[PDB]
Ligand binder design. Structure first.
Ligand SMILES: Nc1ncnc2c1ncn2[C@@H]1O[C@H](COP(=O)(O)OP(=O)(O)O)[C@@H](O)[C@H]1O
Ligand SMILES: [Mg+2]
Lengths: 488, 431, 105
């Protein structure tokens, strides 16, 4: 038939057991048997909402079995091409009709349990059938690209519409099936423009589909090794503009970026240069998401030495930007930056040089007006003090007098081939240790002055930090304990 | 619902945490020396019910409500009142199942009026409607008369008299609610009109631009189909810059969203008109409800005033010649002649008239608690004793708490509390 | 049968309105305003309306109406965003600085 005529007709629209049995009998010999039987199938599909659940179940099973048999035949064998095309078009329109009708009555429910389970089973069967259908390649069948694009949209659009309702997303099986079918659509059949636009529409209009988008992108990156779609999506996010009234859009974008950074740092890191340009926006949630994504990317990429070595310049630029972001109008962006720095410093194997910078920024931020920023800075200092690289010699002991005496001894030893630079490295290490100890002492004094705060969480974190600093022998720790003693 | 216990901490004279329990539901009285703190209990009761007029508690602000304005080691001022909901008739609309409802209000040096219901934080609106549902509307009172205001009851405007009459039958809680609803609908209608105007002025040019570009997209698709030689290629490549090959999906989504918005706006408008007729019909019913309430109040108030004073009568009239719902006045006759001016009446006579009116509203529909603050100041010993005896024996029913300095009132009181000033604090003791 | 279910639905909707848990997400699919249109819920066996229930239902209707207006506004914002296609955040540290005694008490 005609694509446009049937599409327009369906876009504007408001004893069956005997015919179903006749259709089953005719299609049992071969699915290709589909004169007047086509009208009977169309009428039966149009009567789907008014049929009984059992008759619907047999109809769906017959349709899925016939379609799977046709797909298996197309796998097996690969003037006869056009009738293959006609059969494929008829089955595609029939699948559109049945799946659009099944999408109805699902928004009404949970706006029961047995109906939901039956609908989920029918969805699983239809997803298996459509996966078998798309397993073949449609390139040779449709010589021209607009017809192929329309045929693929014929199948992709109904599932995109059915993904609107939340309960379908919660089940793992249907979500996984939709993810793999979208991945095969993007990779095996190209059309990286319609799918990305549909995902952007869903992410702008809905909040619960951000994790779905991130998981689909991760699945494409891992097995289908097609990072171009993620690059284009990130570019569109960077160039996207939001109105001053809506806030669900930026929140969904932020959630999608956070989940993507949690999932695949490496693929999304490539376009981070253009993503940084989005940080200038006045939106709060997007800035927080960018900071959180940067922190997670640099933390998870730390495990692979090759990733750090190959991407030194941009990771260094990102870390410098994160350090500079310690001051902002929004306290929440500063809190996100401190949390990202804590995630970076959770490991002490590498980036020892940046530890001093993080300590200096945390000590400076200790005087911030916001209470949450102060608590996060206290947490960062506690994490830094719990594990530090300064443990190879005389570990777990930070005494200013002893370290100063050791530095003086090293200076005297140098004053009195490998010796020269060996003593130079020892002296610079001891100077770094002295600077770190002085910074910790100043932070301890500031937190001791800060103990008297209205918020209880700040007081608790200050007490925890002071106890941790007392665990290591510190000359000024007793002053902190004395100040804490007045908390009664 | 009746008060069981009252907890006062750091409020005015009660610097420490004091608890008053064993509250007799029959009749309670409070006595003591001047300045002991008898009126401070009533001030605490007013505060825990959400007082709005701060000058009623003789304070310029919440800061004055602290023991010493937060300057003598007292920062948190908390008042806690516990109720009993044994009787389902007096139960609130939303707290029938939950027994022993307790309300706490805490004001600190920096914070202002934190409310707790049964240990759970609640907004001021929750307690406000909760107390209004049981006639305990402190903003428009019907159950308490403050100290020195017994003689000023007759001096309020006819609108205040109408409000007091509406209090008795539950007619109020609806007028102020009607005003709030009308303001909310005005604001929402303004917002909706702005939204409709912006939606039109934005989408309609964009919608017509997309419709115009639809034919160009169709032509591009036709040329692309016909391509599968260069002469078509120049036009195909020049029209490919801005063609949006996947425009159909976004167009369909935009159309669906526009249809949904139109349906939403139509439903909102229909609901608006429907609420209009519902409010109109509710007002129509309220007219006759208030008429019946006024008739009953006039009848029983006249009967009560005749009972207390043998040679006097009083009855209610509409304000001048307009309708009843536009104000009310009281007319009193002594003997066989009516008095033109209410001011010439004796202070004790005005106190008796006010007490008779309060008892009339009690008889029509009693409040759970009735507070009196030295209502016998202008009354002699005989009238005070008669009022006390009538409250104890004849009426019964609702719970009474009265602060009096005359032996004739609390001599027969079932429950007697005594307030003393020991060391910078007020203490309440039994008997 | 129907009367008991209607009473339970009205009571639970009134309770939800009182606790202010009605927002834009659950504004629709509730027939509380249609329940307000029919006064049989408010009128008792004596054929007299109750002002307490009337006020509660009016509060619920106002909350639902406000939530519906907010939902319309956010739908319009989403549609506008769909049809839509310096140095302010960075501030000096000096402006984000701050710049009770128990024994005394
Ligand atoms: N803000 C306040 N700070 C300290 N004391 C107060 C404050 N407000 C009221 N008081 C005390 O509470 C007492 C209230 O006395 P009150 O009960 O009115 O006496 P009476 O019942 O004889 O009129 C007063 O003596 C006053 O000293
Ligand atoms: Mg007094």
């Amino acid at each position: 038939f005609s694509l446009s005529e049937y599409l327009t007709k369906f876009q504007t629209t408001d004893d069956p057991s005997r015919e179903l049995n006749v259709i089953i009998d005719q299609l049992a010999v071969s699915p290709e048997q589909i004169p007047d039987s086509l009208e009977a199938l169309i009428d039966l599909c149009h009567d789907f909402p008014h049929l009984t659940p059992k008759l619907q179940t047999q109809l769906s099973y017959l349709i899925s079995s016939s379609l799977s048999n046709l797909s298996k035949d197309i796998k097996a064998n690969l003037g006869l091409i056009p009738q293959w095309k006609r059969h494929l078009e008829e089955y595609g329109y029939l699948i559109q009709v049945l799946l659009t009708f099944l999408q109805d009555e699902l928004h009404k429910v949970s706006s029961n349990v047995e109906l939901f389970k039956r609908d989920c089973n029918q969805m699983e069967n239809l997803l298996e059938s459509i996966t078998k259908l798309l397993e073949i390649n449609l390139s040779k069948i449709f010589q021209t690209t607009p017809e192929k694009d329309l045929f693929i949209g014929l199948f992709t659009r109904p599932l995109f519409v059915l993904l609107e309702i939340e309960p379908v997303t919660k089940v793992s099986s249907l979500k996984m099936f939709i993810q793999r079918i979208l991945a095969m659509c993007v990779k095996n059949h190209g059309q990286s423009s319609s799918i990305q636009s549909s995902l952007m529409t869903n992410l702008t209009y809905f909040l619960h589909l951000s994790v779905f988008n991130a998981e689909l992108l991760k699945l494409l990156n891992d097995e289908y090794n097609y990072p171009q779609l993620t690059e284009d999506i990130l570019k569109e996010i960077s160039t996207r503009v939001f109105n001053a009234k809506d806030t669900t859009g930026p929140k969904a974008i932020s959630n999608f970026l956070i989940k993507l950074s949690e999932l695949s740092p490496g693929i999304m890191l490539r376009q981070m240069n253009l993503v940084i340009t989005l940080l200038n926006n006045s939106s709060i949630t997007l800035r927080c998401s960018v900071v959180e994504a940067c922190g997670n990317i640099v933390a998870e990429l730390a495990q692979d030495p090759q990733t750090m070595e190959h991407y030194k310049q941009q990771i260094a630029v990102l870390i410098e930007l994160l350090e500079e972001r310690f001051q902002d109008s929004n306290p929440y962006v500063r809190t996100k930056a401190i949390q990202g720095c804590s995630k970076i410093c959770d490991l002490s194997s590498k980036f020892n040089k940046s530890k001093a910078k993080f300590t200096s920024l945390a000590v400076r931020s200790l005087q911030d007006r916001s209470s949450l920023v102060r608590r996060n800075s206290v947490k960062l200092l506690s994490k830094l003090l719990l594990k530090h690289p300064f443990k190879a010699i005389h570990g777990s002991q930070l005494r200013l007098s002893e370290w100063e005496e050791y530095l003086k001894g090293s200076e005297s030893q140098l004053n009195s081939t490998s010796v020269l630079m060996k003593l130079k490295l020892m002296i610079v290490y001891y100077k770094d240790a002295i600077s770190f100890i002085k910074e910790i002492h100043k932070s301890i004094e500031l937190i001791s002055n800060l103990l008297f705060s209205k918020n209880r969480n700040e007081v608790l974190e200050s007490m925890d930090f002071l106890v941790l600093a007392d665990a290591f022998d510190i000359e000024l720790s007793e002053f902190g304990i004395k100040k804490m003693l007045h908390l009664v | 619902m009746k008060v069981e216990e009252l907890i006062i901490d750091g409020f005015k004279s009660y610097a420490t945490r004091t608890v008053i329990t064993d509250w007799d539901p029959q009749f309670n009285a409070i006595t003591g020396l001047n300045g002991s703190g008898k009126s401070n209990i009533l001030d605490a009761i007013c505060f825990v019910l959400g007082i709005a007029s701060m000058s009623t508690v003789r304070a310029s602000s919440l800061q004055d409500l602290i023991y010493k304005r937060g300057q003598a080691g007292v920062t948190k001022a908390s008042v806690t009142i516990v109720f009993d909901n044994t009787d389902k008739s007096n139960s609130p609309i939303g707290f029938t199942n939950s027994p022993q409802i307790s309300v706490t209000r805490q004001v600190v040096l920096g914070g202002t009026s934190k409310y707790l219901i049964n240990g759970h934080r609640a907004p001021q609106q929750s307690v406000l409607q909760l107390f209004q549902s049981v006639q305990l509307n402190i903003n428009n009172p019907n159950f308490l008369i403050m100290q020195g205001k017994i003689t000023k009851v007759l001096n309020m405007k006819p609108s205040e008299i109408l409000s007091l009459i509406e209090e008795a039958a539950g007619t109020k809680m609806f007028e102020d609610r009607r005003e709030k609803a009308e303001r909310t609908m005005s604001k929402k209608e303004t917002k909706l009109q702005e939204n409709r105007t912006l939606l039109t002025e934005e989408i309609e040019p964009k919608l017509e631009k997309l419709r115009n570009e639809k034919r160009m997209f169709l032509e591009f698709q036709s040329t692309q189909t016909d391509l599968e030689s260069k002469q078509l290629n120049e036009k195909f490549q020049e029209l490919r810059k801005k063609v949006n090959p996947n425009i159909m999906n976004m167009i369909e989504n935009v159309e669906k969203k526009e249809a949904a918005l139109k349906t939403m706006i139509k439903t909102i408008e229909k609901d608006k008109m429907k609420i209009q007729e519902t409010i109109s019909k509710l007002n129509e019913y309220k007219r006759e409800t208030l008429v019946k309430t006024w008739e009953k109040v006039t009848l029983d108030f006249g009967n009560i005033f005749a009972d207390l004073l043998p040679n006097s009568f009083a009855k209610l009239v509409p304000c001048e010649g307009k309708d009843v719902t536009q104000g009310l006045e009281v007319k009193v006759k002594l003997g066989n002649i009516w008095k033109e001016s209410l001011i010439e009446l004796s202070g004790g006579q005005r106190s008796l008239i006010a007490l008779s009116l309060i008892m009339a509203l009690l008889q029509f529909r009693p409040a759970p608690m009735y507070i009196l603050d030295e209502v016998d100041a202008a009354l002699d010993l005989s009238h005070t004793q008669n009022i006390g005896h009538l409250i104890k024996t004849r009426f019964k029913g609702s719970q009474f708490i009265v602060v009096s300095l005359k032996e004739g009132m609390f001599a027969n009181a079932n429950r007697v509390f005594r307030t003393r000033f020991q060391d910078g604090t007020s203490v309440v003791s039994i008997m | 049968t129907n009367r008991s279910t209607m009473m339970a639905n009205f009571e639970e909707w009134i309770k939800m309105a009182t606790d202010n848990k009605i927002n834009s997400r659950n504004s629709w699919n509730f027939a509380l305003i249609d329940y307000f249109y029919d006064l049989d819920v408010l009128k008792d066996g004596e054929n007299n309306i109750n002002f307490q229930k009337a006020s509660a239902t009016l509060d619920g209707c106002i909350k639902i109406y406000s939530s519906r207006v907010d939902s319309v506004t956010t739908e319009t914002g989403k549609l506008l965003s769909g049809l839509a296609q310096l140095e302010t955040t960075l501030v000096e540290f000096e402006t984000i600085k701050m710049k009770i005694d128990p024994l005394f008490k």
